[PDB]
Design an enzyme around this catalytic site. Sequence first.
Site, mmCIF file in Angstrom:
data_model
loop_
_atom_site.group_PDB
_atom_site.id
_atom_site.type_symbol
_atom_site.label_atom_id
_atom_site.label_comp_id
_atom_site.label_asym_id
_atom_site.label_seq_id
_atom_site.Cartn_x
_atom_site.Cartn_y
_atom_site.Cartn_z
ATOM 1 N N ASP A 1 43.534 38.430 41.723
ATOM 2 C CA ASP A 1 42.327 38.359 40.898
ATOM 3 C C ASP A 1 42.367 37.165 39.957
ATOM 4 O O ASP A 1 43.050 37.198 38.929
ATOM 5 C CB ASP A 1 42.194 39.661 40.093
ATOM 6 C CG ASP A 1 40.961 39.701 39.223
ATOM 7 O OD1 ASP A 1 40.020 38.923 39.478
ATOM 8 O OD2 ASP A 1 40.931 40.516 38.276
ATOM 9 N N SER B 1 28.604 24.283 37.999
ATOM 10 C CA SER B 1 27.983 23.833 39.247
ATOM 11 C C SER B 1 26.826 22.882 38.949
ATOM 12 O O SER B 1 26.154 23.024 37.924
ATOM 13 C CB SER B 1 27.471 25.042 40.041
ATOM 14 O OG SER B 1 26.772 24.607 41.196
HETATM 15 C C1 LIG Z 1 30.642 41.768 38.076
HETATM 16 S S1 LIG Z 1 32.334 42.356 37.834
HETATM 17 C C2 LIG Z 1 32.669 43.831 38.824
HETATM 18 C C3 LIG Z 1 33.915 43.378 39.608
HETATM 19 N N1 LIG Z 1 34.163 44.323 40.699
HETATM 20 C C4 LIG Z 1 33.864 44.072 41.966
HETATM 21 O O1 LIG Z 1 33.327 43.033 42.346
HETATM 22 C C5 LIG Z 1 34.240 45.175 42.953
HETATM 23 C C6 LIG Z 1 35.609 44.882 43.568
HETATM 24 C C7 LIG Z 1 36.084 45.956 44.505
HETATM 25 C C8 LIG Z 1 37.114 46.805 44.146
HETATM 26 C C9 LIG Z 1 37.544 47.790 45.015
HETATM 27 C C10 LIG Z 1 36.940 47.941 46.249
HETATM 28 C C11 LIG Z 1 35.904 47.103 46.616
HETATM 29 C C12 LIG Z 1 35.483 46.119 45.740
HETATM 30 O O2 LIG Z 1 33.231 45.316 43.999
HETATM 31 C C13 LIG Z 1 31.975 45.634 43.672
HETATM 32 O O3 LIG Z 1 31.688 45.839 42.476
HETATM 33 N N2 LIG Z 1 30.886 45.672 44.665
HETATM 34 C C14 LIG Z 1 31.299 45.436 46.052
HETATM 35 C C15 LIG Z 1 30.523 46.377 46.992
HETATM 36 C C16 LIG Z 1 29.032 45.991 46.987
HETATM 37 N N3 LIG Z 1 28.341 46.688 48.083
HETATM 38 C C17 LIG Z 1 29.028 46.879 45.729
HETATM 39 C C18 LIG Z 1 29.469 46.036 44.518
HETATM 40 C C19 LIG Z 1 35.170 43.256 38.735
HETATM 41 O O4 LIG Z 1 35.344 44.037 37.795
HETATM 42 N N4 LIG Z 1 36.113 42.416 39.152
HETATM 43 C C20 LIG Z 1 37.397 42.339 38.439
HETATM 44 C C21 LIG Z 1 38.559 42.605 39.387
HETATM 45 C C22 LIG Z 1 38.445 43.897 40.193
HETATM 46 C C23 LIG Z 1 38.382 45.142 39.303
HETATM 47 C C24 LIG Z 1 38.250 46.413 40.148
HETATM 48 C C25 LIG Z 1 39.396 46.535 41.156
HETATM 49 C C26 LIG Z 1 39.516 45.287 42.032
HETATM 50 C C27 LIG Z 1 39.601 44.009 41.198
HETATM 51 C C28 LIG Z 1 37.541 41.011 37.710
HETATM 52 O O5 LIG Z 1 37.745 39.942 38.585
HETATM 53 C C29 LIG Z 1 36.438 40.822 36.648
HETATM 54 O O6 LIG Z 1 36.543 39.531 36.046
HETATM 55 C C30 LIG Z 1 35.579 39.272 35.156
HETATM 56 C C31 LIG Z 1 34.747 40.347 34.901
HETATM 57 C C32 LIG Z 1 33.713 40.157 33.980
HETATM 58 N N5 LIG Z 1 33.558 38.971 33.383
HETATM 59 C C33 LIG Z 1 34.347 37.919 33.614
HETATM 60 C C34 LIG Z 1 35.392 38.057 34.522
#
Ligand SMILES: CSC[C@H](NC(=O)[C@H](Cc1ccccc1)OC(=O)N1CCC(N)CC1)C(=O)N[C@@H](CC1CCCCC1)[C@@H](O)COc1ccncc1
Length: 330
Positions: free
Chosen positions: A35, A199
Amino acid sequence: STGSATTTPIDSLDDAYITPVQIGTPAQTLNLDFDTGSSDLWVFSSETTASEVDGQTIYTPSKSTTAKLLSGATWSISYGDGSSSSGDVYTDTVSVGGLTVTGQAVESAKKVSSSFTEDSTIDGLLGLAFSTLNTVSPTQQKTFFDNAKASLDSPVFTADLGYHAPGTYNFGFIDTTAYTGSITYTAVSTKQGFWEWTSTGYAVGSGTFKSTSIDGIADTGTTLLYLPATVVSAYWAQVSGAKSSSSVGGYVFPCSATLPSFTFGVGSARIVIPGDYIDFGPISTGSSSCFGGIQSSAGIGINIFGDVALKAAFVVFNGATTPTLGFASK
Ligand SMILES: CSC[C@H](NC(=O)[C@H](Cc1ccccc1)OC(=O)N1CCC(N)CC1)C(=O)N[C@@H](CC1CCCCC1)[C@@H](O)COc1ccncc1
């Protein structure tokens, strides 16, 4: 020194990617989510409340001879997901694709959110943002990349995510065979602790390129591409039947539709995301409504260049004194 590890999608939608990581002595292999949007290395462990574990591989510090409890240290994290995790901290040996770091902070989870428990394919996270975001208290810890930097042939790591296929995370070198043309480098701001860049614009389909500054972060840990409302509206306006749904929380479109590509600017270069990458399938099994891979950042507060965009390119994260981001077509 260098390291190279294969990263694999967790499902047929490329929702996330897992990479095998060796922890402890003898090695305990866990599949972690790399990540670049966070700076904590945390894992499911023998300390995690038994009821919150469901099929994940756990790290057992008592079984590792190089593990040492970091007395008094604690950690707590909440993701833009609403996801949360917390626990104590150990130091141990960690290797990624041959690259070894001793004394790396390994954050052991005592509590995890149901979102995590429900996700059996992800055993933990490996943060690759800047160490300023690490949540360990009272003593902040360094990331894996920070700890290896010195030993690396070059202070860089590259992300080569696949579309419906495996990809590669390389540490310490640039594989000049992994991309086509040249690499375009662009300035990175570390003020917020993210791989933040700007970008130069965008284009929808074969449309005219619109020169406009878009500040956002390169985040391998986020599935989708989150851009300003104006840009997102212009994209979906080109898809018949597409609309923003309050019930599902985002733009959806008729699964029978053909998605136009999306172009984003990097300096004077352009990266094209094929329309197929933007399709995230039925909102529910059997539904004829599909979820779009380009959504508004309005409610997030920051634009996020997630997997959808990154996987269209070969991405270089240059952790030099003056950090930069390199983008190439592939
Ligand atoms: C708009 S931040 C929401 C984002 N989490 C996602 O992108 C998840 C990831 C996931 C996890 C498990 C299974 C499938 C997908 O996936 C979905 O949310 N989706 C995918 C499925 C789609 N159909 C539904 C929507 C997020 O917290 N990322 C953080 C890392 C993440 C946390 C959850 C576990 C996996 C790693 C991270 O880098 C966030 O950094 C920032 C966040 C906010 N400000 C700046 C930086």
